[PDB]
């Protein structure tokens, strides 16, 4: 997990959302030290347990209410329970990752500090800060707007089904912890995306530096510069492995949540389209499909970008080999090419799957198969 | 995207079909310069928007007509809407690719000019021109014939269902923009196939030159020739990457269109075969299956051929290593083998999938699964 | 396609079955020359066309008879037509491969002669001849027995359904060309399996020779021996590619036939088990499942064995590197290791799929999916 | 198969469970010699045949009883028969593997003795013994508890359905051989997991030794130490191949058993949940799901761990290359890197599939697909 000064806003958002239980004090040199915050550690554990219990308490209350709002039919009960369960597993995995990844966070940030020093010619504090804040603001605004629309639509649905001998508005009011869990999930995805995007961006900066220093006395300094670039590439690969080892189960549960959410929400959209009972509900479900697809991209694209940027470095080095003539420089380029021969670039979610754009194709095939099967389920 | 003098006819076809908004003036040396044509740029954007709007306007008109011809049943409505949607996405992606790939087109054609100069012993202007014109003519003739047959069959179907209190012929007449979109899709596929086939053909010419110059004073010239061949192979690989980066989303949407078209048309053929209501409709649907399979091959085969031709070069170089004895020549062959160790050969459609003949197996499995599921859908 | 003196019996079986239209005259040196036999070329083409036409004529006759025996229900009609179609495509592809693979056959046999000369210490004429004749005899005996059982069972079924106003025995008698096509398919599979098994066996002999000559004046001869082994390995890989290029579509259609046959026969076995109408039919269908699984193994196992044997050579060479000290010998082993780094070992069926034991897992998954879907089809 | 002094308890458990028919006498040096035990060889074969026959005899008795307990409905009959069949195939494959893997067991233990001598600094007799005994005790306790719960639940179900004119308790009493087969399966899985975990643990110890001796006169000894580490890594890879060649079909049938068990038990849990007839049965089925998932992990995780540990050695060696300067030491590290370039690390179950955590994803997808299809089967 990355905590830098440009992206300190994302870290604060994750910290208040029980995902980054670390206390950071900025040094006079601009470097950010990281240490365990036991106050926020117990706060994160307590908040996760309490709000997960509250979310399931509201689920049971809706199921045991006089007039259920969401847990009405057996199919609706199973779909709603699964919808809550995937969010709960994703946020719990994210909090667990944040609690037990302090050492890997320290190693990742130390390596990133060294890499940033190496690539100081391509650092942009303003652009990085605005990109990080923009991504966090857009994600939080999107989830806030969709939560407001969803709660309003469900409040209207509850009012329509309301009977004078029971209250249905409180049933919608008891789903507030579920939407707060959605906020925690959004913060966790923003934090993971920020770290993975930073790794891919630094890989791209390394490739740009290689091409700008080797394809567009002095030879000793140039060889030292190439040695620094090779060390930075190896360190960036280790950083990718650190992020995978720390948040692999979180990414895996995010992917599972995205798959189940897309299938279930599309199935509900088909049911409402067949019934044609409400139009605003259809638009809200379409927005939910967009949100789930966007967060799937937000977890998939950064890993694919990092892998691609890290895998084109060997082609750049091959060109450098075809262009180098100096003995010590050619030996250094040979060492770099040998290192790049066996680099493990792809992001792995605990070894279950490799996180790249191929996951999108697998997700699309699985969504189509399960959706069609559910249609046959409904007709029968 | 390739624009050469032998294949200038395909470029003109793509230009009038809103896919190649580039102005090319032939030099006195025979080289074709390429520049943005703002007249054809705005023409391509305007034509795409206008005819897409007209196609969907005709779709809505058919759905809102007194007697619908194609949008009759809910299953028919969904299938017809999806049939129009995949064509619209494919042609829009192709036009978008053609609008924002001028720089990559310039780089690809510059590299191809250098490669053609290197392999001038294997260039055949007459054969290349006739192959390109033949492929374009066959594709345009096939789509023209199938459009005429489809509109005639649908006109007959509309006449059979016609009632004196409504007009059904105009419903078929409003599907003309959809068939024009089919023409644009055919032109886009011809352009992509021409570029990819040219890359694979040049890879094969490079392999032939390697085998004819190294397996069947002077040594310095021979080593320079091998250096040119190695540079040509690297440039051809970069050309494949340029084509993938420029038209990857177009190829991906073409593949999606082919998959959906094959599944939907086969499902309609099964429905008509079960009903046994019309025989000419069955033959037209069979021709549509042939056309969709042929265009799937036309987008899949060139990429597979390019990958295979580029991947056998390393075996040829290994034989050259086993046959070479000259010091400078052996060093050059060693450099070539090292370069060929890490070549990225497969064509990638935005990283979603690798375009080769394995896609055919995946398509066949997916088609069988979805088709059988649709049969169970219809029986229920 | 391999035609050697030990396996000349398999070649004669394939020749009389319209699969090997080659005229071979044995030399005084024991080498078998191969040339096109226009008499057997036109015989193969004529026999294939005639018996394919007869098989489909009998299919149409059964469908148009007063009391159909196999083409009774629409589901039965589709299953029986597909059962005939896969056999027809497989045998036609095999005959087409045999007609247009004379040059590759010549190259493969020339390479195999050189390899056999290199590995003459491990050649066993008696064992190879008895293995080839045993495989051919077992396959022909199995298909003969199953054809007799199938025709007897169908004759009994026709007699049970017989009505005095029609003849049903002639309906079974018109399926004789279909069973002859099964014989041609068995011969084609035997020929392909013999060639692929020979390639894998020679790979294993090469590995044994490497381990027995390098792991268990003189150094110059030993280096020459290693050069011969490296050339033999490269030639064996080219032989695998020759077999793939010649009979890839035949192997692909054999795999398609095996998949469709297993699914359809298992579905019919489930139908008969549900009906419990006949027990001998159930046993015959179980034998057909065994036969289709065995021929699937007969086409899959040899390719997997060849790939495994060719892929363990690099490990043997790595051990030789760790054991070699002589300068020229170490250089030769380095060249061999470099060659083995980039060997294309897996058998490819026209690039559609890689033929190994992974195909068995894919087949099992596909069979389970389609079978379960067909069960839901039948219940509905 | 591994038989060491720390893990001698697992060997004894496997020996009394007809899985390790080997007689071992401990030497005065602490080394364990292994030889065929014909008494236990015939005991293993006789016990396997007898109890398999008894399990199927009880299955037939339940099917032919007046009031069947488990083989009541046709769906129940098929599910129960498949449940018994997968266990029978798994235990039979395990016994067959144990009977015909004496030579590979000898080779594996000789190699492991050499590796343990090489890595004697990281051997922990107490920790290894307690880990092996703990894993065996936990697995046996879990299967014992679940067998007791399952037999008690089925006894209660039989008592509820009991009619005065028949006995149903004996029907449950005749399923005792099936539960004994479950015990044999648990012992076989413990033995396989112990061997695979030992291989992965030794790979990790080798990586730790490499990092502690090369990253944290004398140079000759250090080079000899690296040569020993390289030999140990190659020997560990050969040990993984020995385990795969010996117990590949056993692992494959264990995977098939796990897949079928998870699908069938989940389907029965869904049926009972829909019926809501018994709650204790639901809890027992949930425990069975946990047990099948845990044994799937117990067969999948060790292979994935071994592959990962063996695949990070090349990265460690790359760092050593970047840190080494001594000529003979650098040459030794170059040899080690060359060896690690082409290491076959993944565990293969007879080539059908590669055993790693990707199997979990494939299993999850297959389970979801078959389960949903079975739900549609039940509703229809």
In chain D, what residues touch A380 (CB-CB under 8 Å)? 376, 379-380
Residue B378 assigned to a binding site: no
Report the C-alpha gap between C42 and C53 in whole angstroms: 16
Instruction: Tell me the CA end-to-end span of chain C in Å, nearest whole number.
Output: 48
Give CA–CA dist B218/B328, Å, rounded. Answer: 12
Pull the structure tokens for residue C205. 């002999």
Pairing of strands B32-36, B347-348: unpaired
Structure-block tokens of residue D240: 């993984």
Q: Looking at the partner chain, which of C344, C351, C369 has a beta carbon nearest the beta carbon of B357?
A: C351
Q: Check residue B4 and report its DSSP letter.
A: -
Output the six-digit token pair for C352: 């559609």
Give the whole-angstrom CA distance, residue B374 versus residue B360. Answer: 21
CB spacing of B373 vs C370 below 8 angstroms: no
Cα dihedral A146, A149, A152, A158, rounded to 10, equals -80
Q: How far apart are the first and last CA of chain D?
A: 48
| CA dist., res. A6 & res. A153, Å (int) | 38
Distance of residue B360 Cα from the nearest chain C Cα, in angstroms: 7
Within 8 A of B270 by CB-CB distance, chain C residues are none
What number of other Cβ atoms are within 10 A of residue A290's Cβ? 12
Closest residue in D to C356 (Cα) is D351
Which is nearest to C195 in space by CA: C242, C235, C232, C234? C242
Task: Please indicate whether, in this complex, the C-beta atoms of A342 and D376 are within 8 angstroms of each other.
Answer: no
DSSP string spanning D184-220? HHHHHHHHHHHHHHHHHHHHHHHHHHHHHHH---HHH
**Structure-block tokens of residue D142:** 């879990």
Is D71 within 8 Å of D62 (Cβ atoms)?
yes
- Answer yes or no: do D357 and A350 touch at CB < 8 A: yes
Chain A residue whose CA is closest to D376: A377
* Contact (Cβ atoms closer than 8 angstroms) between residue C104 and residue C242: yes
Other CB atoms closer than 10 Å to residue D331's CB: what's the count? 12
What is the SS3 assignment for D53? helix
Residues of A in contact with B374 (CB under 8 A): 372
Whole-angstrom Cα distance, residue B161 to residue B171? 12
**How far apart are alpha carbons D154 and D76 in whole angstroms?**
14
Across the interface, of C308, C311, C375, the residue whose CB is closest to D377 is C375
DSSP H stretches of helix in A119-168: 125-161
Residue A343, phi-psi category: left (phi > 0), alpha (psi -120 to 50), beta (remainder): beta
Structure tokens at B273: 């075969």
Q: What is the DSSP letter of C88?
A: H
Tokens of residue B156, six digits: 């007959």
Angle at B349 between CA A290 and CA A262, to 5 degrees: 25
| H or E element that contains D25 | strand D22-26
Return d(Cα C343, Cα B311) in angstroms, integer: 11
d(CA C296, CA C263): 13
Nearest one of A104, A135, A114 to A13, comparing CA atoms: A135
- B contacts of C344 (beta carbons < 8 Å): 311, 315
- CA–CA min distance B111, chain C (Å): 28
Residue B318: both structure tokens together: 């290994």
What does the alpha-carbon distance between residue A197 and residue B172 come to, in Å, rounded to a whole number?
Answer: 50
Give the span between the Cα atoms of D245 and D252, in whole angstroms: 12
Place of tokens 């703990």: D134
Interchain proximity B352–A356, CB inside 8 Å: no
Tokens of A116: 């940033």
Please check if A376 is assigned to a binding site: yes
> Among A138, A350, A336, A319, which residue's Cα sits nearest to residue A256?
A350
Question: Rounded to the nearest 10 degrees, what angle do helices D176-214 and D38-63 cross at?
Answer: 130
Number of C-beta neighbours around residue A160 at 10 A: 10
Enumerate residues 6+ apart whose C-beta is below 8 A from C283: none
For C121-182, give the secondary structure using H, E and C. Answer: HHCCHHHHHHHHHHHHHHHHHHHHHHHHHHHHHHHHHHHHHCCCCCCCHHHHHCCHHHHHHH
CB spacing of A357 vs B338 below 8 angstroms: no
**Phi then psi for B33, rounded to 5 degrees?**
-80, 150
Select from C315, C369, C379 the residue whose CB has the most chain D CBs within 10 Å, as the one to mutate to test that interface. C315
Q: What b-and-e string marks burial along C217-250, b requiring 16 or more CB atoms within 10 Å of the CB?
A: eeeeebbebbebbbbbbbbbbebbbbbbebbbbb
Rounded Cα gap, residues C185 and C296, in angstroms: 12
Burial zone of D321 (CB within 10 Å; 0-12 exposed, 13-18 middle, 19+ buried): middle
The technique by which this structure was obtained is cryo-EM
Subunit contact C352:B358, Cβ cutoff 8 A? yes
Euclidean distance between CA atoms A175 and C115, whole angstroms:
75
Element (H, E) at D141: helix D125-161
Strand extents, DSSP E, chain A? 22-26, 32-36, 347-348, 354-355
Output the six-digit token pair for A279.
Answer: 């139009």
- Looking at chain B from residue 348 to 377, which residues have their Cβ under 8 Å from any Cβ of chain A? 350-353, 366, 369-370, 373-374, 376-377
Give which of A219, A147, A143 is closest to A186, Cα–Cα: A143
Closest CA to B97 of B372, B359, B349, B337: B349
Rounded CA separation A206/A340 (Å): 13
Resolution in A: 2.8
Check: CB of residue D269 under 8 Å from CB of residue D252: no
User: Cα separations (Å) of B198 from A136, B1, B343?
Assistant: 46, 10, 19
C27 close contact with B: CB closer than 8 A: no
CA atoms within 13 A on the CB side of D292: 24
A221 shares contact with chain D (CB less than 8 Å)? no
3-state secondary structure at position D104:
helix
Helix (H, G, I), strand (E, B) or coil at A18: coil
Number of C-alpha atoms within 13 angstroms, CB side, residue B42?
Answer: 2
Note whether D100 and D1 are within 8 A (CB).
no
Rounded to whole angstroms, how far apart are CA atoms A181 and A92? 10
Distance, CA of C125 to CA of A40 (rounded, Å):
79
């Amino acid at each position: 997990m990355e905590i830098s000064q440009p992206s300190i806003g994302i870290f604060y958002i994750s910290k208040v959302l029980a995902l980054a239980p670390y206390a950071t004090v900025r040094n006079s040199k601009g470097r950010v030290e990281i240490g365990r915050s036991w106050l926020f550690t117990v706060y994160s554990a307590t908040l996760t347990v309490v709000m997960v219990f509250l979310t399931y308490r509201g689920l049971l209350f809706d199921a045991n209410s006089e007039i259920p709002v969401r847990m009405k039919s057996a199919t609706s009960k199973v779909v709603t329970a699964l919808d809550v369960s995937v969010v709960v597993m994703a946020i719990v995995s994210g909090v667990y990752c944040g609690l037990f990844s302090l050492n890997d966070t320290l190693e990742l940030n130390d390596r990133l500090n060294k890499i940033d020093n190496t690539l100081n010619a391509y650092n942009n504090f303003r652009r990085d800060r605005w990109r990080a804040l923009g991504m966090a603001a857009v994600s939080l605004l999107a989830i806030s707007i969709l939560v407001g629309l969803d709660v309003g639509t469900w409040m209207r649905i509850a009012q329509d089904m309301n009977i004078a001998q029971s209250d249905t508005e409180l049933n919608v009011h008891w789903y507030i912890p579920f939407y707060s869990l959605y906020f925690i999930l959004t913060g966790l995805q923003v934090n993971i995306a920020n770290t993975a995007y930073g790794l891919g961006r630094r890989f791209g900066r390394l490739n740009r530096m290689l091409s700008s220093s080797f394809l567009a006395a002095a030879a000793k300094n140039k060889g030292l510069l190439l040695k620094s670039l090779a060390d930075s590439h190896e360190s960036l690969g280790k950083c990718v492995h650190l992020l995978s080892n720390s948040f692999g189960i979180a990414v895996l549960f995010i992917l599972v949540s995205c798959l189940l959410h897309l299938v279930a929400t599309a199935y509900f959209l088909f049911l409402e389209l067949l019934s044609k009972r409400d139009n605003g509900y259809l638009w809200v479900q379409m927005l939910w499909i967009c949100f789930h697809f966007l967060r799937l991209l937000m977890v998939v694209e950064p890993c694919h970008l990092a892998a691609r940027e890290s895998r084109k470095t060997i082609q750049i080095v091959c060109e450098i080999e075809r262009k180098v003539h100096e003995p010590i420089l050619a030996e250094a380029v040979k060492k770099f090419w040998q290192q790049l021969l066996v680099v493990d670039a792809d992001f792995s979610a605990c070894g279950l799957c490799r996180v790249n754009r191929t996951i999108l194709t697998s997700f699309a095939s699985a969504i189509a198969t399960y959706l069609v099967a559910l249609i046959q389920f409904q007709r029968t």
